[PDB]
Amino acid sequence: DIQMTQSPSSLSASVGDRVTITCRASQDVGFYVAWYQQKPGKAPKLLISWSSYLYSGVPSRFSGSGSGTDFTLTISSLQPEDFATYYCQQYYNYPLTFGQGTKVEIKRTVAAPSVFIFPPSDEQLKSGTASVVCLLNNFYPREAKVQWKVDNALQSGNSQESVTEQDSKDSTYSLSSTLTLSKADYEKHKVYACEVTHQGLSSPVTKSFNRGEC
Amino acid sequence: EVQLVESGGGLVQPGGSLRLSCAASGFTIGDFGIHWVRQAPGKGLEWVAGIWPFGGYTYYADSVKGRFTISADTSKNTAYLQMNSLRAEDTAVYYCARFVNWDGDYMDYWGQGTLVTVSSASTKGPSVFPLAPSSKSTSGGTAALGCLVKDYFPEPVTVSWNSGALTSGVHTFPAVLQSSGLYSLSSVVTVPSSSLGTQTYICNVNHKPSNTKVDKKAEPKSC
Amino acid sequence: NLLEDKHNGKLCKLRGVAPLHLGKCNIAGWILGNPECESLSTASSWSYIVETPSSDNGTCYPGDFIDYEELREQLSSVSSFERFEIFPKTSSWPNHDSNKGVTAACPHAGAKSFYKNLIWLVKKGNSYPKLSKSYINDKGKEVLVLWGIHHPSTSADQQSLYQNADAYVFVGSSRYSKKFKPEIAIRPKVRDQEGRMNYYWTLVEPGDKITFEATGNLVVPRYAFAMERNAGSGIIISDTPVHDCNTTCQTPKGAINTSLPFQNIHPITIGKCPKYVKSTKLR
């Protein structure tokens, strides 16, 4: 049976630009190819039927081509909404095969984070646990480095980040880094700093807080 | 309005069994046919099952032969994927999609997806705490406040802020797994000082796989 | 006796394989299954085809055959060729109407009728929902497949027949790809028909899939043809009869029992035929 190799596996390109996504079938299919855009989470949507023919949505810049063994989906004037992931399907025979996808990333003008740092409060210190969260909000590019420091002792191998999906409106990421120590370890230090080494900060920007209600 | 609303997925014990329906508002069923395509996160889409009702025929992918079976009630507009002997590879987002040429077509409409999760066991809720803001007001100690939805199993949680009243600025993050094997995500929403203690904020944290319903409140400092 | 200016005045065979004789029909009539050719659907294999110069029963409904001369050539020299029901009337158009469509243009004896090998899909009640049937060449030879696009004259005509003005047809294979838009427009009657209908045709590789998709205006295939090409022949336009005889050259005027170098008879010829010029005597 058949398999649908894509190229590249993901792509960076600024607004206005010609994105091109090629797809190599393993058997000579013919025009029995479709293209799907799927905005992460939600259910995929059909772009091109029959190799070239724009499906009746509002997809004017998206346009198919190709034949035989290799098919190409172009995007002539890219948008903040084309951030999604793109697959070629076949229906020449079964099992019906898709590619792995191509993740087209939008480039845009660099913006710095609104950095924050957050203590626990209520039931979290009631658990023999403690989790401090180091928030970034609407920065670009993705490549950041939030780094925890307790007093001035540098951390390692216990926090965990989560980078949200890029925005279809302005193309920025909000990040959060959740640092988890036991409450046997929490109160034994007084200062928790979280620093942010970032491409759009001419020098690093740390926010800290000293465990202090009393 | 064309519709493929899919229902009845969740957590289950390995070597197990769950039926998963794909129902249809708007249109009929028999003259069309339905395909089950699933998506184990990060791979990309994979076709598993297909049915042509008017024809009466069904065909299956190599990888789910003999376990899953597609039925369809003409009386109820609905089609059903019976999933036997489930595995960790079958833990996925399953999509039914509308289809016409039994010789091989494309997908006019998909539903929205159902989440199926199958490994070990757990039927646990989430604890919800606040992520306390600091300093003063916007540009020089801004008010960014939130709820940490730590320790539960499995996905998802519908973390809707005040019935989704201010769904602008929000970032309900991608969950992550700790040593325990329990999903944890943070929630955040940005706002200046004219909506600080001046505003009320609940997070309607909605983990449904064991319907825990925490309306925890992240307010100003308590002293 | 070592030259030739004579013809037998007949149309003999070639490799002891007789011509396909179309009678009053032309090629298009014959392949589309014109009703006035029903007597020649059972034609089993042949050397060369014979139209007549007044073979007027062809495309009884008006409009263009696309690549007619290409299809003419394709059919001229042919060994063993066989008609089959590609998309059965029984099972292939379940939710479109499969008999409402006949016309005054294509009549078999004072009765509205239509082509044998094609079938004119009309709407079933209130809707022409998308069809999308496909055929797999499970025959191990060039399957010839023909179909039609219909082009009504009024916008009302469209609703009446196919319901949807947003109508298209698509045909697709590993060698063919076309979308058809119905060009709906008022026209001078031809055979009491303001509408028109264009006939197209394609060959399908063995193993290959061919698929029809349509929201309207499709004249779907019913009967297609598994054929094996031959070569070194064409179509000859004569009035002289066929006979039960052997030859190794043929011309519209007649046959040539030839061992010899040239001829004065007719320039278009078939098989082991001398060149045309003028050749009568050698003392």
What homologous superfamily does CATH list for C1-17+241-283? Answer: Hemagglutinin Chain A, Domain 2 (2.10.77.10)
Nearest Cα residue in chain A from B36 = A96
How far apart are the C-alpha atoms of A10 and A102, rounded to whole Å?
5
Approach to solving? X-ray
| Residue A142 φ/ψ, nearest 5 degrees | -60, -50
Q: Which spans in chain C are helix H?
A: 27-32, 68-76, 155-162
How far apart are the C-alpha atoms of A57 and A11, rounded to whole Å?
24
Q: Which two tokens stand for residue A71?
A: 């098919």
Environment class of residue C124 by beta-carbon count within 10 Å: exposed (0-12), middle (13-18) or buried (19+)? middle
Q: Could you give the domains of chain B?
A: 1-120 (no CATH), 121-223 (2.60.40.10)
How far apart are the C-alpha atoms of B37 and B56, rounded to whole Å?
20
Q: Does the distance separating the beta carbons of B31 and C211 come in below 8 Å?
A: no
Closest CB from A45, A95, A118 relative to B62: A95
Q: Does the distance separating the beta carbons of B132 and A119 come in below 8 Å?
A: yes
SS3 A43: coil
Q: Which residues of A touch B61 (CB under 8 A)?
A: 94-95
Contact B179, B166 (CB under 8 A): no
Q: Residues 161..190 of C with a Cβ closer than 8 Å to B: which?
A: none
Report how far Cα B48 is from the mean position of its chain's Cα atoms.
19
- The DSSP letter of residue C25 is B
Helix H or strand E encompassing A184: helix A183-186
Q: Which two tokens stand for residue B205?
A: 């944290």
Nearest Cα residue in chain C from B99 = C132
Which chains reach chain C with 3 or more Cβ–Cβ distances below 8 angstroms? A, B
Q: Which residues of A touch C213 (CB under 8 A)?
A: 50
Shortest Cα distance from B58 to chain A (angstroms)?
A: 12
- The domain spans of chain A are 1-108, 109-211
Q: Is A32 on the interface with C (CB under 8 A)?
A: yes
User: How big is the B-C interface in CB pairs under 8 Å?
Assistant: 20
CATH 2.60.40.10 fits A1-108, yes or no: yes
Q: Does the distance separating the beta carbons of C174 and A53 come in below 8 Å?
A: no
**Complete DSSP assignment for B114-163:** EEEB-SS------EEEEE---SSSSSSS--EEEEEEEEESSS-B--EETT
Residue type, A120: P
Q: Which residues of C touch A67 (CB under 8 A)?
A: 177
Contact C15, C77 (CB under 8 A): no
Closest CB from C94, C132, C136 relative to B105: C132
How far apart are the C-alpha atoms of B2 and B13, rounded to whole Å?
34
How far apart are the C-alpha atoms of C236 and C243, rounded to whole Å?
15
- The domain spans of chain C are 1-17+241-283, 18-240
How far apart are the C-alpha atoms of A160 and C88, rounded to whole Å?
63
Q: Does the distance separating the beta carbons of C95 and B104 come in below 8 Å?
A: no
Contact C173, C210 (CB under 8 A): yes
Residue type, C27: I
Residue B169 gets the label, from left (phi > 0), alpha (psi -120 to 50) or beta, of left
Q: Is B106 on the interface with A (CB under 8 A)?
A: yes
Q: Does the distance separating the beta carbons of C132 and B101 come in below 8 Å?
A: yes
- Rg from Cα positions in chain A: 23
Q: Is C132 on the interface with A (CB under 8 A)?
A: no
How far apart are the C-alpha atoms of C72 and C233, rounded to whole Å?
11
B158 closest CA partner among B115, B190, B96, B117: B115
Fold observed for domain A109-211: Immunoglobulin-like (2.60.40)
Nearest Cα residue in chain C from B54 = C94
Report how far Cα A200 is from the mean position of its chain's Cα atoms.
18
Shortest Cα distance from C180 to chain A (angstroms)?
A: 12
Q: Which two tokens stand for residue A20?
A: 């091109």
Q: Does the distance separating the beta carbons of A28 and C172 come in below 8 Å?
A: no
Residues in chain A: 214
- The DSSP letter of residue A200 is T
Q: Do domains A1-108 and A109-211 have the same CATH topology?
A: yes
Q: Does the distance separating the beta carbons of A53 and C170 come in below 8 Å?
A: yes
Q: Which residues of A touch C173 (CB under 8 A)?
A: 30-31
CATH number of C18-240: 3.90.209.20
Sign of CA dihedral A43, A49, A54, A57: negative
Q: Does the distance separating the beta carbons of A46 and B142 come in below 8 Å?
A: no
